[PDB]
């Protein structure tokens, strides 16, 4: 029985990056050729593994994380990177083994007048640890005066909307992103390629 990658890659709705979705993929045969033989992607980078060797490899589990960000932020979804996305929304570990796959989704996720439903976190007291998720909406105290749950000077709501309009430049157009993590633990493998 094939791993259900279509449920991730072809989902009608993608998460906002601050609330990024994770799907655990386990106890299935993964045919990654549906991915690496595709011409549909704008970014396809694998760390610690070559994607053309994946159909002959076994992992303990696979995780598929997904979200939308603007095109000029896809570069932050890589080990060691910084920026509002890497620091406050979605952080890969330095020793990441997996693939980062992205594609322009302008005709799905933008609209005339603006689609504002996709959010990212703009302020945080500290950087996220790898694979940490923060969905809190506490007012961010940027100064010495406590905010007491009310916004104002130096007291900001911490999430901001992207405003995706189709005439945006490509750096500001929406990109759907899927991060595949290939987990190897001292435990039986449950996700193998067809050749294994």
């Amino acid at each position, epitope marked *: 029985n094939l791993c259900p990658f279509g449920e991730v890659f072809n989902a*009608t*709705r993608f998460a906002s990056v601050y609330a990024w979705n994770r799907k655990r993929i386990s106890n299935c045969v993964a045919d990654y050729s549906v991915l690496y033989n595709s011409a*549909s992607f704008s970014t396809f980078k694998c760390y610690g593994v070559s994607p053309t060797k994946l159909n002959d490899l076994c992992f303990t589990n696979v995780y598929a994380d997904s979200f939308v960000i603007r095109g000029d932020e896809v570069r932050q979804i890589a080990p060691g990177q910084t920026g509002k996305i890497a620091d406050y929304n979605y952080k890969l570990p330095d020793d990441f083994t997996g693939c980062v796959i992205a594609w322009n989704s302008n*005709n*799905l996720d933008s*609209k*005339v007048g603006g689609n504002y*439903n996709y959010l990212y976190r703009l302020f945080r007291k500290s950087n996220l640890k790898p694979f940490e998720r923060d969905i809190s909406t506490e007012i961010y105290q940027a100064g010495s005066t406590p905010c007491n749950g009310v916004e104002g000077f130096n007291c900001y709501f911490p999430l901001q909307s992207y405003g995706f309009q189709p005439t945006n430049g490509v750096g500001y157009q929406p990109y759907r992103v899927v991060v595949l993590s290939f987990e190897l633990l001292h435990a039986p493998a449950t996700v193998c390629g067809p050749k294994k």
Partner: antibody
Amino acid sequence: EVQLVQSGAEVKKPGESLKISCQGSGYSFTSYWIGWVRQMPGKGLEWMGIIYPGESDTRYSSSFQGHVTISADKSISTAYLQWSSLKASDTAMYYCARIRGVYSSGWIGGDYWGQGTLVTVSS
Amino acid sequence: DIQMTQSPSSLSASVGDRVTITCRASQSISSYLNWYQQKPGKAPKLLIYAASSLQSGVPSRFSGSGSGTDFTLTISSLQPEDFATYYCQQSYSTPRQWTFGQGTKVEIKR
């Protein structure tokens, strides 16, 4: 079984308002886009717009934006199409249709359709 | 803004014939192409999506092919209940710009 059930035929005078409806059953109403298609007498088909119930997202076809309002009420699984001021030009069959979804970077067509609502605008 | 055009305008074919209908887009729509069947007095019915995938419950005699700007609907072994108008529709663009072809009428010769 997925089913879309539309309200009954309507006749209205020019300038009157009108709201027609379409109720989805047999699936998760908040999990699919749903929308409206116009078919004028003896003519072809035209998308008017779509809405994703419960997610604050309505998208209008370019020739219908500003002339109709599409809305939804997820608690009764019902989608709506509304005119503030009808013109005899609005006489048509109106269909609601569930959009099957998306894949890669584009959309799928409508996989389930209502039975249609005839709207007659006449004095 | 993407114009969809269909050919032929109408045709007549006998039971068991193969019907071939084509659809052209004014610019590439990749694979995002749907075929609908509309029988007199009924709502359109989705037959094919993604240019070549069969919608659940649709008989296997319906098939689609093509990509880019040019697409084909084929009905093998035409049945009496297949008389209808068939429409293509691109779903490559935003919903704001989704467009239909003008339909091909299929009549049964007997």
